[PDB]
């Protein structure tokens, strides 16, 4: 089972250091008991002796429908609960609407291709509205208002604030069953903050710890993780358990390829984007 | 959305410039900027069904590069009334940042008083560099620039207008405040290259565009 | 209008403190009605209260033929007044004979490819002769001997001497209309006076101060500026209202390219040089 870091403070670590662990992404004993000293030492204000005490004290302790049946059939059922799956794609592929669909459909019974729980919706880009969810909910038969409560929304403008919204996920995801965890245009805040060519190693380290946070959370709570990415990095192509490629098919109809998957078949399926969310294409 | 005057640059922007926005367009000198501004100042006055925003443009000129002749050359391209366009492009010229900001005290009040689709502050960053030329002035010039950007963002959000600022690469909060950023760079003859350098939604992507008697036009070659 | 900055003394700032603004390089009210707070505070001993009083009191108050018809046609009529042109490219390509041509032709009525005023002729290279202006003047039906005085010639030995001729110009240009301000080999003294490669930033910021004098003279009183650059800068591309590239054609034939223009196309034209100045390519 999971190992939460809410056990660490009472060993002797001060709560504001446990909050620095949570807000840096180490939401768990399953991120600090069996970890290298350098990773703890990298966190703001935490000393090497405090990293030693954190390790010694922690060592006392220790499928969802996309709304398109055809893309779900390519996924052999849909997005896997307790996984990361990445979609990357071309300009105006409607990626936020795929996310609003998944945010609604994760709440459904698993046999309907549901997930039986809430979504987080970490935003980077302001393409979310409550209205988007309302018009989607009424297709799938969910209440639109409860769908907003079941799609915990906040926007970040920078990757630390975004990491803090994964802290909000890590604390609050205990209070209800989440089936899903969205970060919409997840790579875009790394591109806003780390546009300077030489800073790519710090983007890669911050993004690698962020991808781990998403994976721990998927392992801790059984959430599917959905992260949307942009075609003109490759760290997400193997941190995701299968990769999806989106191109600009005609109208709101978009082509998906399973671009790499040594399990699900590496084929294609066609889907439409609607006010009702993602659905299957009709000619 | 407002047309840049090039359908292909508008397709890079996925329908044109956005009403309710700040945009910054940048890169080298002569990379579309002032001609984009003149084209937008006219085209924003078109019906939304014709590719405008159904409203006026403010044109704060930091530099003296404003021309009624270039406004008229774009007005007649779209069959707009030339002299009404010269009045609907509300002209003000500033040699400095305090007058630029005083014109935003006027414009944030005056944009209540008609339907505006756009505001331009052409070459805004040059006034900061030429006024706050003493290197040590970093925090003050940055927070005056942040005040100016918040006034422009207030204008964008309060009036539903597109808002335009232009920069010659020769402060960085502009990249945070800009909803789509354009790294405009050198082309062949009067042709030029646009790259989307930053948007939280749109990817890194590119399109060729042209500077003509049309104003800004499609680079069909 | 070119209204003297001295009017500010009747408004509230004391006489000698108003005269600091002429020493800093603003000679009219219109310039300082459009000054900022911080740039006035850069002028010797101006406080926030003096700067505010200056701004409020000032705000209370407030084509030339190249000799080639084909290059004039390329320039959509020839050189505009109230302007900054930079001409660059190889040695012996004709820049000084374009300058001798413009030096005469700016004194003409605008109808005859004119500028309607006298000319400053700063020179750094010493390639000017009074004898060159004579043979150009008689082609344009001007009095060659009056052309020698209507051209206010001066050589500079060094960059700030070259700039001090703009202080002489700034006192002069209030008095009556000048159409033109040549600066032959404008860049060369910065290369002889800041010759170490770590000095180039200081040369460029001194040339930016010289260009701010040329800029404010061009707006404050309406001169065309003709800066000529030797070859065998990034700020100067924005400061110039057009950039021109020159190379040697066959025999006495010369080639002009518009290298960089805000409304003119970057095309090429063929020209020649003789005793009468710049001709068209008429071999």
The chain B residue lying nearest A229, using CA atoms, is B203
Phi, psi of C107 (to 5 degrees): -75, -15
Resolution (A): 4.1
Structure tokens at B16: 């044109």
Give first-to-last CA distance, chain B, whole Å: 26
CB contact under 8 A, B126 and C267: no
Q: Please spell the DSSP secondary structure of chain A, one letter per residue.
A: ---BGGGTGGGT--HHHHHHHHHHT--BGGGTTT--HHHHHTSTT--HHHHHHHHHHHHHH--B--S-HHHHHHTTTSBPSSEEEEEEE-TT--HHHHHHHHHHHTTS-GGGT--SSEEEEEESSS---HHHHHHHHHHHT--HHHHHHTEEEEE-SSHHHHHHHHHHHHHHTTSS-EEEEEETTTTHHHHHH--SGGGHHHHHHHHHHHHHHHHHHHHHH--EEEEEEE---TTHHHHSSSEEEEE--STTEEEEEEEE-SSS-S-EEEEEEETTEEEE---
Query: CA C82, C86, C89 angle in degrees (round to 5)?
Result: 160
Q: How far apart are CA A166 and CA A164, in angstroms?
A: 5
Cβ–Cβ < 8 Å for C33, C58: yes
Query: CA A35, A41, A44 angle in degrees (round to 5)?
Result: 125
Q: How far apart are CA A64 and CA C102, in angstroms?
A: 77
Of A163, A149, A67, A73, residue with least CA distance to A115: A67
Structure tokens at B51: 């590719």
Sequence-distant contacts of B96-99: CB under 8 A, at least 24 apart:
B96/B127, B96/B131, B96/C34, B96/C35, B96/C36, B96/C39, B97/B127, B97/B128, B97/B131, B97/B132, B97/B144, B97/B148, B97/C36, B97/C38, B98/B131, B98/C35, B98/C36, B98/C37, B98/C55, B99/C34, B99/C36
Cβ–Cβ < 8 Å for B162, B40: yes
B185: annotated binding-site residue? no
Q: Could you identify the residue written with the tokens 């104003």?
A: B215
Q: Residue C80 carries which DSSP code?
A: P
Q: How far apart are CA A174 and CA A171, in angstroms?
A: 6
How many other C-beta atoms can be found within 10 angstroms of the C-beta atom of residue A14? 10
CB contact under 8 A, C238 and B132: no
Q: How far apart are CA B218 and CA C165, in angstroms?
A: 47
Buried b (16+ CB within 10 A) or exposed e, B45-83: bbeeeebbbbbbbbbbbbbebbeeebbbbbbebbebeee
How many other C-beta atoms can be found within 10 angstroms of the C-beta atom of residue B140? 13
Dihedral angle over CA of B40, B43, B49, B53, nearest 10 = 60
Q: How far apart are CA B81 and CA A228, in angstroms?
A: 46
A176 Cβ contact list (under 8 Å, min separation 6): A117, A118
Q: Could you identify the residue written with the tokens 């459009």?
A: C34
**Interface chains of chain C (3 or more CB pairs under 8 Å):** B
Structure tokens at A7: 């056990």
Of C145, C117, C149, C121, residue with least CA distance to C131: C145
- For residue B141, list chain C residues with Cβ-Cβ distance below 8 A: 38
C7 Cβ contact list (under 8 Å, min separation 6): C29, C61
Q: After which residues is chain C broken (C to N over 2.5 A)?
A: 62, 232
SS3 C119: strand
Cβ–Cβ < 8 Å for A142, A93: no
> How distant, in Å, are the alpha carbons of B70, B78, B111 from that of B51?
19, 10, 21
Of C108, C105, C109, C157, residue with least CA distance to C133: C105
Q: Residue C251 carries which DSSP code?
A: T
- For residue A96, list chain B residues with Cβ-Cβ distance below 8 A: 201
Q: How far apart are CA B63 and CA B129, in angstroms?
A: 13
Phi, psi of C182 (to 5 degrees): -80, 145
Phi, psi of A225 (to 5 degrees): -115, 125
CA-based nearest distance C183→chain B, Å? 23
Cβ-Cβ contacts under 8 Å between B and C: the total is: 56
Beta strands across the sheet bearing C277-280: C151-155, C118-123, C178-184, C224-228, C83-89, C242-248, C253-260, C268-274, C277-280
Q: How far apart are CA C271 and CA A43, in angstroms?
A: 69
Phi, psi of C203 (to 5 degrees): -60, -45
Q: Please spell the DSSP secondary structure of B119-185, one letter per residue.
A: EEEETHHHHHHHHS-STT-HHHHHHHHHHHHHHHHHHHHHH--EEEEE-----THHHHH-SEEEE-E
CB contact under 8 A, B198 and A191: yes
Interface test with chain B among C77, C262, C268, by most B beta carbons within 10 Å: C262
How many other C-beta atoms can be found within 10 angstroms of the C-beta atom of residue A129? 12
Give first-to-last CA distance, chain C, whole Å: 46
Task: Please report which residue ranges of C62-199 form alpha helices under DSSP H.
Answer: 69-74, 95-105, 130-139, 144-150, 159-172, 188-193
Sign of CA dihedral B164, B169, B171, B175: positive
Q: Please spell the DSSP secondary structure of B17-79, one letter per residue.
A: BPSSEEEEEESSTTSSHHHHHHHHHHHTTS-TTTTS-SSEEEEEESSS---HHHHHHHHGGGT
Cβ–Cβ < 8 Å for B181, B205: no
- For residue B204, list chain A residues with Cβ-Cβ distance below 8 A: 191, 230, 232
Structure tokens at A145: 């208002």
CA-based nearest distance A35→chain B, Å? 33
Buried b (16+ CB within 10 A) or exposed e, A50-62: bbebbbebbeeee
How many other C-beta atoms can be found within 10 angstroms of the C-beta atom of residue C196? 8
**Do C and A have ≥3 inter-chain CB pairs under 8 A?**
no
CB contact under 8 A, A192 and B205: no
Task: Say what angle helices C95-105 and C130-139 make with each other, to 10 degrees.
Answer: 60
The chain A residue lying nearest B174, using CA atoms, is A192
Q: How far apart are CA A136 and CA A133, in angstroms?
A: 5
C212 Cβ contact list (under 8 Å, min separation 6): B130, C25
Q: Residue C64 carries which DSSP code?
A: B
Of C219, C274, C254, residue with least CA distance to C74: C254
Q: How far apart are CA B8 and CA C117, in angstroms?
A: 46
Cβ–Cβ < 8 Å for C72, C279: no
Structure tokens at A122: 């970490």
What are the binding residues of A for ATP? 89-96
Q: How far apart are CA C106 and CA C225, in angstroms?
A: 11
CB contact under 8 A, B175 and A192: yes
Q: How far apart are CA A229 and CA C76, in angstroms?
A: 49
Q: Please spell the DSSP secondary structure of C253-268, one letter per residue.
A: EEEEEEEE-SSS---E
Q: How far apart are CA C272 and CA C283, in angstroms?
A: 8
Cβ–Cβ < 8 Å for C140, C200: no
Q: How far apart are CA A47 and CA A14, in angstroms?
A: 13
Method by which the model was determined? cryo-EM
**Residue A254 CA to its chain's centroid (Å):** 22
- For residue A189, list chain B residues with Cβ-Cβ distance below 8 A: 200
Cβ–Cβ < 8 Å for B185, B195: yes
The chain A residue lying nearest B12, using CA atoms, is A91
Which residue among C36, C260, C267 sits closest to B30, beta carbon to beta carbon? C260
Q: How far apart are CA C236 and CA C239, in angstroms?
A: 5
Dihedral angle over CA of B1, B6, B10, B15, nearest 10 = 50
Which residue among A92, A96, A192 sits closest to B198, beta carbon to beta carbon? A192
Segment (H or E) for C38:
helix C37-42
Q: Residue C194 carries which DSSP code?
A: S
Query: CA B125, B129, B132 angle in degrees (round to 5)?
Result: 125
Structure tokens at C221: 């009183």
CB contact under 8 A, A91 and B176: no
Radius of gyration of chain A (CA): 19
Cβ–Cβ < 8 Å for C243, C52: no
Cβ–Cβ < 8 Å for C245, C257: yes
Sign of CA dihedral C76, C81, C84, C90: positive
Look at phi and psi of residue A108 and say left if phi exceeds 0, alpha if psi is from -120 to 50, else beta. Answer: beta
The chain A residue lying nearest B177, using CA atoms, is A157
Segment (H or E) for C237:
helix C234-239
C210: annotated binding-site residue? no
Residues in chain B: 221
- For residue C212, list chain B residues with Cβ-Cβ distance below 8 A: 130
Q: Could you identify the residue written with the tokens 């009605």?
A: C33
Identify the contact set of chain B against chain A, taking CB-CB distances under 8 A: 12, 14, 175-176, 197-205
Give the bridge partners for A180, in sequence order: A119, A224
A160 Cβ contact list (under 8 Å, min separation 6): none
Q: How far apart are CA C65 and CA C132, in angstroms?
A: 17
CB contact under 8 A, C34 and B99: yes
Segment (H or E) for C4:
none
* Burial class, C251, CB count within 10 angstroms (exposed 0-12 / middle 13-18 / buried 19+): exposed
Q: How far apart are CA A242 and CA A74, in angstroms?
A: 12
CB contact under 8 A, B30 and C262: yes
CA-based nearest distance A188→chain B, Å? 5
Which residue among B14, B198, B202 sits closest to A195, beta carbon to beta carbon? B198
Cβ–Cβ < 8 Å for B68, B77: no
CB contact under 8 A, B205 and A126: no
Interstrand relation of C253-260 and C268-274 (parallel, antiparallel or unpaired): antiparallel
SS3 B100: helix
Phi, psi of B180 (to 5 degrees): -135, 135
Interface test with chain C among B27, B28, B29, by most C beta carbons within 10 Å: B29
Interstrand relation of B56-61 and A224-230 (parallel, antiparallel or unpaired): unpaired
Q: How far apart are CA A80 and CA A110, in angstroms?
A: 11
> How distant, in Å, are the alpha carbons of A185, B201, C125, C245 from that of C128?
64, 59, 8, 21
Interface test with chain A among B12, B16, B201, B202, by most A beta carbons within 10 Å: B201
Segment (H or E) for B82:
helix B82-88
Cβ–Cβ < 8 Å for A120, A180: yes
Query: CA C32, B93, B24 angle in degrees (round to 5)?
Result: 120
């Amino acid at each position: 089972g999971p190992q939460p870091i809410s056990r660490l403070e009472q060993c002797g670590i001060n709560a504001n250091d446990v909050k620095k662990l949570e807000e840096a992404g180490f939401h768990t004993v399953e991120a600090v008991a069996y970890a290298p000293k350098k990773e703890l030492i990298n966190i703001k204000g935490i000393s090497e002796a405090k990293a030693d005490k954190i390790l010694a004290e922690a060592a006392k302790l220790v499928q969802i429908t996309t709304g398109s049946k055809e893309l779900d059939k390519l996924l052999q059922g849909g997005i896997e609960t307790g996984s990361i799956t990445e979609m990357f794609g071309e300009f105006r592929t409607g990626k936020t609407q795929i996310c609003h669909t998944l945010a609604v459909t994760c709440q459904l019974p698993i046999d309907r291709g549901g997930g039986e729980g809430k979504a987080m919706y970490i935003d980077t880009e302001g393409t979310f509205r409550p209205e988007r969810l309302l018009a989607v909910a009424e297709r799938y038969g969910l209440s639109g208002s409860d769908v907003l409560d079941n799609v915990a929304y906040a926007r970040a403008f920078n990757t630390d604030h975004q990491t803090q919204l994964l802290y909000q996920a890590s604390a609050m995801m205990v209070e209800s069953r989440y089936a899903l965890l969205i970060v919409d245009s997840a790579t875009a805040l790394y591109r806003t903050d780390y546009s300077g060519r030489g800073e790519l190693s710090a983007r890669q380290m911050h993004l690698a710890r962020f991808l781990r946070m998403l994976l721990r959370l998927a392992d801790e709570f059984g959430v599917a993780v959905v992260i949307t990415n942009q075609v003109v990095g490759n760290i997400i192509a193997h941190a995701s358990t299968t990769r999806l490629y989106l191109r600009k098919g005609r109208g709101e109809t978009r082509i998906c390829k399973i671009y790499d998957s040594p399990c699900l078949p590496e084929a294609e399926a066609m889907f439409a984007i609607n006010a009702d969310g993602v659905g299957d294409a009709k000619d």
